[PDB]
Symmetry: D2
Subunit: 416 residues, 4 copies
């Protein structure tokens, strides 16, 4: 009732401002968030779980309950999924393959993802994918695709090519393209003499990695740039410009990770620029805290700004919204929960924006009104709309979800 009242009051309020709450909700239903699987087990995977996170990335904290196998992960995702309203997808890492016998990265197969697929099918989730170019013996020098050693490079070329097939298979089965993100950690710790050659090797390898033409309705290739990593602070082969060059020149999607840029730099600004040269965008929405730290997405400035950028431009299809974080210092199910929910709260908010009006004031140089309107948006009752969205998806509206998380912990997590 309370929700209902609150909701009805809000319907009016916004109605008065040319804002349709019901259309907003419906629109929110068209914006699936691809939840990254790796937040479930600290990016450990099933190749070699107990094994060491490498690649300039680090999961911090020692919170208990990480999932230890596929079975647990899915149980975890599910618990998470039932507290997050609306559309979601699952973003899988090659290292999350399910096999009886070990599989050389350069030999993976669709079959090794069969259980995921099936589960996706039963959970009504699309699947996204990623070759795993880190935490590997051959990723030990700090180079994979750009590595000078031909064999090494080949092996990474081979892994990604195969990964494309797994992806293609995902969409074939699921009926939704699987976006396949290519992120390599390649780079240097200190003053480099040759940033050139390594960029060149990368270029050619990427080239080779994409050679195989696959059906766009099943699969999409994306590239992710990064500024620096722990242990590779000085130079990243695959820089922003490198990939911009690449995505543009080869027409692949471009992945923009919110924690991968310079201080003060924001990907929300990059969206509109990039969409004029690259077919599609993949966004790894992350919260960086002074480094690509991978903290949990908040309902904050940048998250909201990203959201607006998407929504304002009706990028329902060319933008694949993903999450990218891995906080190991809190309950991971909650992490996913909070992050996911925030992303959606940010999208809804953007969807409740009287954008045409504002676009309008703006085009007219009425910057006073622009500012004023945007700021007043913040005090409109959008919470009421969020809470109803939750309820229509039979998801807790408020803090109560924590209880569910606290109960699953008790019964399941505490015994791992």
């Amino acid at each position: 009732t309370q929700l209902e009242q609150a909701w009805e009051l809000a319907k009016q309020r916004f109605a008065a401002v040319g804002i349709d709450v019901e259309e907003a909700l419906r629109q929110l239903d068209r914006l699936p968030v691809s939840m990254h699987c790796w937040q479930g087990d600290d990016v450990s995977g099933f190749e070699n779980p107990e094994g060491s996170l490498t690649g300039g990335i680090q999961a911090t904290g020692n919170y208990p309950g990480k999932a230890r196998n596929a079975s647990e992960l899915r149980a975890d995702l599910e618990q998470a999924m039932r507290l997050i309203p609306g559309p979601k997808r699952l973003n899988l890492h090659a290292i999350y393959l399910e096999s009886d016998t070990p599989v050389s990265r350069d030999q993976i197969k669709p079959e090794h993802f069969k259980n995921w697929v099936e589960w996706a099918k039963a959970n009504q989730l699309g699947l996204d994918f990623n070759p795993s170019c880190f935490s590997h013996p051959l990723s030990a020098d700090g180079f994979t695709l750009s590595h000078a050693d031909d064999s090494i490079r080949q092996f990474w070329i081979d892994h990604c090519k195969a990964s494309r097939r797994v992806s293609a298979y995902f969409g074939e089965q699921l009926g939704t393209p699987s976006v396949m993100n290519i992120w390599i950690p390649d780079g240097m710790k200190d003053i480099t003499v040759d940033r050139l050659a390594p960029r060149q090797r990368l270029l050619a390898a990427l080239d080779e990695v994409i050679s195989e033409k696959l059906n766009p309705a099943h699969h999409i290739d994306a590239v992710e740039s990064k500024l620096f990593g722990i242990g590779a602070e000085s130079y990243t082969v695959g820089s922003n410009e490198f990939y911009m060059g690449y995505a543009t020149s080869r027409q692949t999607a471009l992945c923009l990770d919110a924690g991968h840029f310079h201080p003060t730099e924001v990907i929300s600004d990059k969206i509109s620029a990039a969409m004029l040269y690259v077919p599609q965008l993949l966004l790894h929405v992350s919260r960086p805290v002074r480094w690509d730290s991978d903290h949990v997405v908040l309902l904050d400035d940048e998250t909201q700004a990203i959201a607006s950028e998407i929504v304002r431009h009706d990028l329902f299809d060319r933008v694949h919204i993903g999450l990218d974080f891995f906080d190991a210092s809190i309950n991971r199910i909650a992490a996913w929960v909070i992050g996911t929910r925030n992303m959606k709260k940010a999208l809804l908010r953007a969807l409740l924006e009287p954008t045409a009006e504002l676009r309008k004031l703006e085009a007219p140089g009425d910057y006073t009104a622009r500012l004023a309107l945007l700021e007043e948006q913040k005090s409109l009752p959008w919470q009421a709309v969020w809470e109803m969205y939750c309820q229509r998806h039979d998801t807790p509206a408020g803090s109560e979800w924590l209880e569910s998380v606290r109960a699953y912990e008790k019964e399941i997590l505490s015994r791992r």
Copy 2:
């Protein structure tokens, strides 16, 4: 009715989290916001109205309607005040003095501020003050109080000494101490050989400037650092360390300006640290956009942070909340309206936080719940609380205030 309705619902919602919205309102009214006079006329002042803004600060935009005299300013202020709910104060600069005849900065007197005082009483506003140490022949070298020339330096000293006397007068008259902030533009543009001599002279001058012991119930001295300014980019005499040092040893108030630090640096963090060392804090809430640009204050991450830090620690007495912006690209009144309501909105939300519980969770390492609840706070119905606050203060609840501005503009600003 609707407000009353949303109000009532919010009352319960918050009550459920142990928050008494009524109390919150009462507390808000204990948090005066000191509106800066200079946004009204782009810091032109009345000594030399038309006659260049200098010191590394600048007002941008050529939006019409700026006040041209004290009369216009008070009128503009008043319009602003009626759209801003609750307690406010006016923060004045010396060049805003009123005299028939010109007055040397080194010879200002209370009396050049009499009108101000009477208006202040009429409007039930408190007054704060500031020596004007820029826009002046005597400051064109880029040094005032740190000036090598004994004469010039003496002039600035004397000017600030007189100032304190003005300020002290305000406190006496209004029954509320007047905080007088000390801000100099002293610095260098390029590579500097000696950052020491200027600082030594600044130190000596300030001591000289505050040597006259005045009644604390009437006046308080504050000092504000800065990192860089246009045309004094390389070095700044009164830096952060300089003034933390000064305020700490001399026991003056410390002034923290949100647009005065390094990229990513935040004053929110500084509050709790500084207060452990200085007797009072003066906050210059400002929005920087890649420089000390003085844009209008938004209800954003940082402003919220600021509000939270104050409130969480019951900083009602020791913190003097001020604004510091000067957008000349939009309507000045709106500027003040958006900024002040934004500050108050942040405080109010801060007042509606279940800090005790959060504190307690935090104190137990319950970081999962801290983050969750923190985040869930963002969706509690504070907006209903704000709107009733606006209402109880006969202030517009929403964007309708823009119509008042628009009206005033047409009928009065259009005529300037």
Copy 3:
């Protein structure tokens, strides 16, 4: 004699480390620096000299002696040039035209630059050009090529196409291609609603601007990204990505200005990535000081970094080196002097690097040798090498050149 000896020694030290100093000088002679004309008059131009620098760019300080016409400018330039060893070019702005009658920027013609051309011929200078998209009533809104108004746009587009015609003229005449850079201040000062449309317009306009096919051997087009400017702090139409995309897609040259990026962002890193996609690069070596302040180029980390990347990669043809600074607080000739000499020094030091060796150490994981070998170069006698370069070029090797300035000052600048 002293110099002579210094040389021999240096000559030996270096050979001792696989470095041929003769060969460096030779190489240095293959690296011209394009001196920006605008430093001589604080970007006043001849169109409307006494008129007002607009564009989010600024010139600070009030150092006397500014040139006020082509004559002075060329006079000041020559004094500079005689104090700067080796190759140079002049980079001209459209507003530096010479006409008896005022010209609409959309109608400039080669003939408006004939004097510059003949002067260039007499001084063995190549010439570079730039359309002027600021300090103009048609730029007063903060938009030019991306203006929503078709006519304004048109105006700017037109101006640009004409510019290209002047540039080609230069190269046909001079026998070396003129690089024509396109920089526009378009952006917003505050929170922007629509970042997409202005970029779409920009895009289209650009396409139109470059439509007229020119002789590559005479003319080259370059686009220059920027992050933010004063009074346009919140969003910049031609942001990094926009032009990265653009240059790659249309295959124009990319212009990298060292003062246009985020804090801590460096163009030195961008060189080699950009070069795998764009056919050419134009560098605007500048020194930002917490904003694109345009201070004089120092022989510092980034300047040196920039030089290394060029040299390391033998980008003797695809990279066009130019300066970009305008300090109005010190003698302007001095400014060019210090600036270009510095750039030249950075280049030589880079040419003195035992690159093939370091490259090989780094290819082998010999990071220890790398780092040490890198820092030791800093103490080899490159100076004996520089000073000889200077002697051979009949330029002061040392600080003595300050005297020629001081004199010129007296003698000339002093009457202005």
Copy 4:
């Protein structure tokens, strides 16, 4: 003569032209010791628990072989570096570097657990500086130590620090030079924080407790080191800049400024003149951050140079304590120390060779053109020959050759661990 001699003589003249006395410079360089950090020798592992994980928000990156593994190795390693670095040095010790047969609780160390250090110090003519170790420890696992809400955890840390003070004083007493004892804690939060006051308040009262024992300034100086953020502690730092500036001022302790502990673009060279008008002394942790407090080797760069300039400009020979702070585990540790050390010294030399008075004078006259121009020209003045001469005079290799030695030491020695 030797080429070096030639080149020296030439510089000798060039510098005398600008009024600089090269011999005077070298003399001054010898009054500016660089306290080398011991932890670069073993990736901050310590001896308490040599392998067993670095914590507190700092990390050593790189898997370069050879790390020293005990006080003997460390000492030998330090020696090799020292022979390749000219002039004055000091050694900066951390408590975990203690030497004991038995295991010692941090809160109970004693002067006796560093006796070998002291002895070797006198032998080598090194003054010793010190530090309590507040990380890589079970009682520091929650991320709090001196500011921990827990009374016992707090007490523990407090006790260790108090104790650390006695060792430091004992170092001073023995070496005849005060030992600067730096206080750095990793205290902070990884994520959004509710109560930034409480901890800071606790830290405050703890510090007061920590320095309540009156010791001989001639033997001991307490310094406090602020930090912005650490890995796993990115969002809040108890001992923030303002925290310690306020602390050092109000308590008159020295203030530690770590070149890698501040915001993007923030520089410590700027802080020196400011800081010194309020605090008695300064301790500098010259370090090279690369996007985070990563502890990369100090180079001859813009900031290192500026740091030096600021010290030398104000003849800060006694109130400024020049230390190094870096830990790169991806290259030969000896080389690391060597590079960093000489670099600092190179910078210092440059400052000594600068014509300050004239520069200062131009500046005081608004002759900003001369100033800039002259600053730039210093840069191509042959300070190098001077440096090569400082090297020779201290029987340290002048150039790159030092690498050959590191090479050989690694072959024989390092290549066996």
